[PDB]
Design an enzyme around this catalytic site. Sequence first.
Site, PDB file in Angstrom:
ATOM      1  N   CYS A 146       0.877  -1.217   0.000  1.00 13.03           N
ATOM      2  CA  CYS A 146       0.000   0.000   0.000  1.00 13.03           C
ATOM      3  C   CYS A 146       0.909   1.261   0.000  1.00 13.03           C
ATOM      4  CB  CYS A 146      -1.025   0.078   1.222  1.00 13.03           C
ATOM      5  SG  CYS A 146      -2.023   1.624   1.603  1.00 13.03           S
ATOM      6  N   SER A 180       0.524   3.742   1.743  1.00  8.58           N
ATOM      7  CA  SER A 180       0.778   4.150   3.109  1.00  8.58           C
ATOM      8  C   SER A 180       2.035   3.529   3.675  1.00  8.58           C
ATOM      9  CB  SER A 180      -0.404   3.861   4.002  1.00  8.58           C
ATOM     10  OG  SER A 180      -1.553   4.524   3.539  1.00  8.58           O
ATOM     11  N   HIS A 223       4.680   5.632   2.570  1.00 10.74           N
ATOM     12  CA  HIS A 223       4.737   6.869   3.371  1.00 10.74           C
ATOM     13  C   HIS A 223       5.609   6.754   4.624  1.00 10.74           C
ATOM     14  CE1 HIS A 223       1.831   8.685   0.835  1.00 10.74           C
ATOM     15  NE2 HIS A 223       0.745   8.454   1.539  1.00 10.74           N
ATOM     16  N   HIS A 261       0.440  -3.518   6.496  1.00 16.49           N
ATOM     17  CA  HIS A 261      -0.834  -3.482   7.195  1.00 16.49           C
ATOM     18  C   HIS A 261      -1.988  -4.056   6.430  1.00 16.49           C
ATOM     19  CE1 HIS A 261      -0.674   0.169   4.775  1.00 16.49           C
ATOM     20  NE2 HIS A 261      -1.982   0.290   4.908  1.00 16.49           N
ATOM     21  N   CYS A 303      -7.147  -3.257   3.415  1.00 17.66           N
ATOM     22  CA  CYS A 303      -6.886  -1.833   3.277  1.00 17.66           C
ATOM     23  C   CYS A 303      -7.453  -1.232   2.031  1.00 17.66           C
ATOM     24  CB  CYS A 303      -5.407  -1.425   3.399  1.00 17.66           C
ATOM     25  SG  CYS A 303      -5.422   0.425   3.421  1.00 17.66           S
TER      26      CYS A 303
HETATM   27  N1  LIG Z   1      -7.751   6.915   4.644  1.00 18.81           N
HETATM   28  C1  LIG Z   1      -7.304   5.633   4.660  1.00 18.81           C
HETATM   29  O1  LIG Z   1      -7.697   4.792   5.478  1.00 18.81           O
HETATM   30  C2  LIG Z   1      -6.297   5.303   3.583  1.00 18.81           C
HETATM   31  C3  LIG Z   1      -6.227   3.897   3.267  1.00 18.81           C
HETATM   32  C4  LIG Z   1      -5.555   3.617   1.999  1.00 18.81           C
HETATM   33  C5  LIG Z   1      -4.837   4.596   1.380  1.00 18.81           C
HETATM   34  N2  LIG Z   1      -4.779   5.860   1.918  1.00 18.81           N
HETATM   35  C6  LIG Z   1      -4.039   6.885   1.263  1.00 18.81           C
HETATM   36  O2  LIG Z   1      -4.648   7.128  -0.018  1.00 18.81           O
HETATM   37  C7  LIG Z   1      -3.677   7.609  -0.927  1.00 18.81           C
HETATM   38  C8  LIG Z   1      -3.722   6.835  -2.216  1.00 18.81           C
HETATM   39  O3  LIG Z   1      -3.227   5.513  -1.948  1.00 18.81           O
HETATM   40  P1  LIG Z   1      -3.054   4.526  -3.174  1.00 18.81           P
HETATM   41  O4  LIG Z   1      -4.197   4.528  -4.060  1.00 18.81           O
HETATM   42  O5  LIG Z   1      -2.636   3.229  -2.552  1.00 18.81           O
HETATM   43  O6  LIG Z   1      -1.787   5.206  -3.851  1.00 18.81           O
HETATM   44  P2  LIG Z   1      -1.187   5.320  -5.261  1.00 18.81           P
HETATM   45  O7  LIG Z   1      -1.221   4.022  -5.978  1.00 18.81           O
HETATM   46  O8  LIG Z   1       0.126   5.986  -5.124  1.00 18.81           O
HETATM   47  O9  LIG Z   1      -2.175   6.319  -6.036  1.00 18.81           O
HETATM   48  C9  LIG Z   1      -2.092   7.755  -6.023  1.00 18.81           C
HETATM   49  C10 LIG Z   1      -2.374   8.240  -7.417  1.00 18.81           C
HETATM   50  O10 LIG Z   1      -2.332   9.669  -7.349  1.00 18.81           O
HETATM   51  C11 LIG Z   1      -1.784  10.148  -8.577  1.00 18.81           C
HETATM   52  N3  LIG Z   1      -1.330  11.487  -8.368  1.00 18.81           N
HETATM   53  C12 LIG Z   1      -0.198  11.932  -7.756  1.00 18.81           C
HETATM   54  N4  LIG Z   1      -0.193  13.281  -7.781  1.00 18.81           N
HETATM   55  C13 LIG Z   1      -1.346  13.669  -8.384  1.00 18.81           C
HETATM   56  C14 LIG Z   1      -1.890  14.991  -8.697  1.00 18.81           C
HETATM   57  N5  LIG Z   1      -1.221  16.058  -8.375  1.00 18.81           N
HETATM   58  N6  LIG Z   1      -3.006  15.012  -9.284  1.00 18.81           N
HETATM   59  C15 LIG Z   1      -3.680  13.902  -9.596  1.00 18.81           C
HETATM   60  N7  LIG Z   1      -3.194  12.665  -9.381  1.00 18.81           N
HETATM   61  C16 LIG Z   1      -2.036  12.565  -8.738  1.00 18.81           C
HETATM   62  C17 LIG Z   1      -0.698   9.165  -8.935  1.00 18.81           C
HETATM   63  O11 LIG Z   1      -0.348   9.201 -10.308  1.00 18.81           O
HETATM   64  C18 LIG Z   1      -1.346   7.838  -8.500  1.00 18.81           C
HETATM   65  O12 LIG Z   1      -1.941   7.109  -9.564  1.00 18.81           O
HETATM   66  C19 LIG Z   1      -2.356   7.579  -0.179  1.00 18.81           C
HETATM   67  O13 LIG Z   1      -2.021   8.863   0.396  1.00 18.81           O
HETATM   68  C20 LIG Z   1      -2.581   6.575   0.930  1.00 18.81           C
HETATM   69  O14 LIG Z   1      -1.708   6.760   2.022  1.00 18.81           O
HETATM   70  C21 LIG Z   1      -5.573   6.204   2.993  1.00 18.81           C
HETATM   71 ZN   LIG Z   2      -3.341   1.278   3.510  1.00 21.90          ZN
END
Ligand SMILES: NC(=O)c1ccc[n+]([C@@H]2O[C@H](COP(=O)([O-])OP(=O)([O-])OC[C@H]3O[C@@H](n4cnc5c(N)[nH+]cnc54)[C@H](O)[C@@H]3O)[C@@H](O)[C@H]2O)c1
Ligand SMILES: [Zn+2]
Lengths: 374, 374
Positions: A46, A48, A51, A67, A174
Site C-alpha cells: 500500500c 501508506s 509513506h 498493514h 486496506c
Molecule cells: N484513509 C485511509 O484509510 C487510507 C487507506 C488507503 C490509502 N490511503 C491513502 O490514499 C492515498 C492513495 O493511496 P493509493 O491509491 O494506494 O496510492 P497510489 O497508488 O500511489 O495512487 C495515487 C495516485 O495519485 C496520482 N497522483 C499523484 N499526484 C497527483 C496529482 N497532483 N493530481 C492527480 N493525481 C495525482 C498518482 O499518479 C497515482 O496514480 C495515499 O495517500 C494513501 O496513504 C488512505
Molecule cells: Zn493502507
Amino acid sequence: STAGKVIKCKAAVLWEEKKPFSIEEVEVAPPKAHEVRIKMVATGICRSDDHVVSGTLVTPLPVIAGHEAAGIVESIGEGVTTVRPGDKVIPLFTPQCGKCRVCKHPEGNFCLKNDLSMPRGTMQDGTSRFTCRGKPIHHFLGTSTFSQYTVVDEISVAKIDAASPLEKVCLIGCGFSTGYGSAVKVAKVTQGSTCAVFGLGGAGLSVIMGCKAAGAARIIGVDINKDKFAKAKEVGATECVNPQDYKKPIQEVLTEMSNGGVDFSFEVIGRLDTMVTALSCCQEAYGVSVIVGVPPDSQNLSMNPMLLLSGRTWKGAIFGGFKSKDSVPKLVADFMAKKFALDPLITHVLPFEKINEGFDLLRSGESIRTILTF
Amino acid sequence: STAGKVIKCKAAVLWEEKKPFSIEEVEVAPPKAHEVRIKMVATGICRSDDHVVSGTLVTPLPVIAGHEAAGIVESIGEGVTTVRPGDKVIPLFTPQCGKCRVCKHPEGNFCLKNDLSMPRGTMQDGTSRFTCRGKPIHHFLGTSTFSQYTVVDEISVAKIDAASPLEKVCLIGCGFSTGYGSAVKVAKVTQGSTCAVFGLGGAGLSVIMGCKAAGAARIIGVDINKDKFAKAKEVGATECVNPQDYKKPIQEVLTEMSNGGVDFSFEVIGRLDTMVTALSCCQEAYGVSVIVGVPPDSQNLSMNPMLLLSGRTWKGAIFGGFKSKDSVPKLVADFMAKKFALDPLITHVLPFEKINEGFDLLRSGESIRTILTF
Ligand SMILES: NC(=O)c1ccc[n+]([C@@H]2O[C@H](COP(=O)([O-])OP(=O)([O-])OC[C@H]3O[C@@H](n4cnc5c(N)[nH+]cnc54)[C@H](O)[C@@H]3O)[C@@H](O)[C@H]2O)c1
Ligand SMILES: [Zn+2]
Ligand SMILES: NC(=O)c1ccc[n+]([C@@H]2O[C@H](COP(=O)([O-])OP(=O)([O-])OC[C@H]3O[C@@H](n4cnc5c(N)[nH+]cnc54)[C@H](O)[C@@H]3O)[C@@H](O)[C@H]2O)c1
Ligand SMILES: [Zn+2]
Ligand SMILES: [Zn+2]
Ligand SMILES: [Zn+2]
C-alpha cells in the site's frame, strides 16, 4: 510445534527512513493474553507503507511495516475467543475494541485504541513482540504484516471464511475497503450522481468501484499519470482527465464539465493542494468532498471558508468508515458471493523476498497493487 | 395612488465604510416585471449588516443595507403571481428561484441567483431601483430593508400569514432561522447529544434554541463576553465558558468537558481561528462542525487535514439550510402556533430614525437584536 515458543522467521525490517527494507531473521515472541500470532500468507504493498519509508507518515523506527494482509492463525494467547489456530484472518489496522465511545457510536469507526493518531509502534500493552539482531523492533498500526509471522491484539484481527483466497482478499484489509467504503458509506454516493475521483491508484480505483455500485451516472477520474486511465475506465470511470493537459486549474475544468460542480468528490492522493481542489470542484451548495489520502506529516492546508459557508460538506475517513472487525468478514463473504471484484486492483504478484522490487514498481507508477506471497 | 410612480421616502444610506448611516431621502422606482415594492414595517440590525460597514463583508457602495425585515406589499410588477398588494411579506436575502439545480436539489438552498457569493448590489436585471442625491445606490443581497420602501425580485420575497406580528417575525428573515436551521437541518443534532456553540449573539442563541428543540442533553455556550451567558442559559445552554478564563486553548477545555469531544459544534462568530477551534473540539471520529459565521473578506484559514481524516465532518450553510420561500411562511405559521419563541432574541426596540444608536448598541456588546420600526 511452535505454540508457546519464540519463532525465528524471516521479515522485512525498516531500520531507517528512505532506505530499502532489510529482509532478515527476526524473533517473534509468543502471544500474551488477548493476543494472536499469525502465519502470513499474502500482504499488499500500500502507498501508506511507502509513506513510512518516505517520512510522509511518522511512526517509530526501526519497524516492521505492512498493514494490508491475510494469514492463518498459528496460536492464541489466554483469553482469546474470536479466532482459533488454523483460522484464516485479516489483521485490522484500525482496531475494533467494541468498548470505546467510537465503537459504540453508530457511525464511528476510528476506535480509540488505534495507533495512527499518536503512533507508539507497540502492542496494546506498550511492548513489542519483535527482536532483530538483539534489538527491539516496532510494530506498525498494530499489524506489522511484512513478516512471515506477526502478533496482533485480538481487537486487531478478524476471522474470515475458511475457503477464502488469501492472495486476493488481503486487499479487504486496506485498499479495497477504504475506497469502496469512502464512496458507499462515508460519502453515501447517490444514484444518478456525478463523482470526481482524484488519484487512480488502488484506493482510487476502489472509490470508483463504490461510486459505480452506488449507481453514479458519471465518474470522472483525475490523475497526472495517463497510464492509469484505462484501468479506471474498466472499473467504472466514464471519463478521465489529466490536470497537466489544461491551461486552467482542474477545479474549474471539473466545475465546467459538471455544469456547476460535482455531487461527490474524493481526494485519493495525499496532497494538500488536491484536497482543496477536490473540495472546490464539488457543487457549492450541496456538494460533498471526502479526503482519503494521507497528508504529509504536520503540514496544514490553506482554504477559504466561504467554500463551506455556501453549503459544502467536507469529511475524511480511515478505512472507508467501516467498523473493522464487524465489516471485514462480511466484505470477504460478499467477495465470495461475487458482489465485487478484486482482480482489477492486482497488477503484480511477487514472492515476499522481492518486497523492494514491489516498492520500486509502486514508486515508478507501474503498479496498482503488488501482492507479496510468503 | 403610488402604484407605477416613483416613491420618495427616507432610507439609511451607507456612503462609505466605517461611517454612520445617513438617514435621508431616496427615490424608489416602481417595480418592473416580476418585482415587488414593499412598505417596510420592521427591520432587525444583524451583525452581517455591520459587516458591510466594517468591510468584513464586501459589497458595492454606496448601498442601502438591511436584510432581516418584514413589511407589506405596496405594489407588484407585471407577471407577479406569488404576492399581492396588502400582503405581509418577508424579504429573502437568499432567493428561491425554484428552477436552478440548487433549488431543485432536495437539500440545497443557496440558490444560484443569490447576490452573496459575488456581490453586485443590483436587482436580478443588473440595475438599481434606488436614487439618492441624483446618484444610483446599490442594493444589498437583493433586499435592502433599511428603507421605508424597497423593491425586490419576486424570487426574493415570501408571503406570510396576514395576522403575523411583523415586529417579531422579521427575525425569521435571518437570525432565528439561520441559527435554528443550522442546528436542526444542517447539523441534524440528535437527542441526548453534546453540542458546543461558539458565539452567543442572535444567531448563536438561535442555534441553542435548535439544539434544545432537537433534544441535546448538553449545550455548552462559548463567548468571550460573559454578559451573554444569562440569556444563553435561558434559551437552553446547560453551561457557559469564557475562553479568556482558561490557560489552555478552549478546544482542549471542551474536549475534556465532553470526555473526548462534542457531537456537534457551531461557529457563530466569523473568525478564522474559532472556525478551526470549533472543528477541533468535535469528536475526531464522528463529530460534526457547522460554520455559520461570516469570515473576513478574502481571507483563508489554515488547518491540519488530519482533523478530517479521522472522521470529522465540516460543513457550513447560509440561512440555516432552509429553502427560503418554502420555509419562511412555514416558520411564521409555527411561530404563530408557539412552536418557538422570538422574544428572547429581542433586547431593544428603536424607531428607524435611531438606526445609528441601534448599531452602537450592537457594537458595544449590549444588544442581541434591536428591532427598528418604520
Ligand atoms: N484513509 C485511509 O484509510 C487510507 C487507506 C488507503 C490509502 N490511503 C491513502 O490514499 C492515498 C492513495 O493511496 P493509493 O491509491 O494506494 O496510492 P497510489 O497508488 O500511489 O495512487 C495515487 C495516485 O495519485 C496520482 N497522483 C499523484 N499526484 C497527483 C496529482 N497532483 N493530481 C492527480 N493525481 C495525482 C498518482 O499518479 C497515482 O496514480 C495515499 O495517500 C494513501 O496513504 C488512505
Ligand atoms: Zn493502507
Ligand atoms: N450563515 C448565515 O446565513 C448567517 C446569518 C446570520 C448571521 N451570520 C453571521 O453569524 C455571525 C454571528 O452573528 P450574530 O449572532 O448576529 O452576531 P453577534 O451578536 O455579533 O454575536 C457574535 C458573538 O460572538 C462573540 N465573540 C466575539 N469574538 C469571540 C471569540 N473570539 N470567542 C468567542 N466568542 C466571541 C461576541 O461576544 C458575540 O456575543 C456573524 O458573523 C454573522 O455575519 C451568518
Ligand atoms: Zn474502540
Ligand atoms: Zn434557484
Ligand atoms: Zn443576517
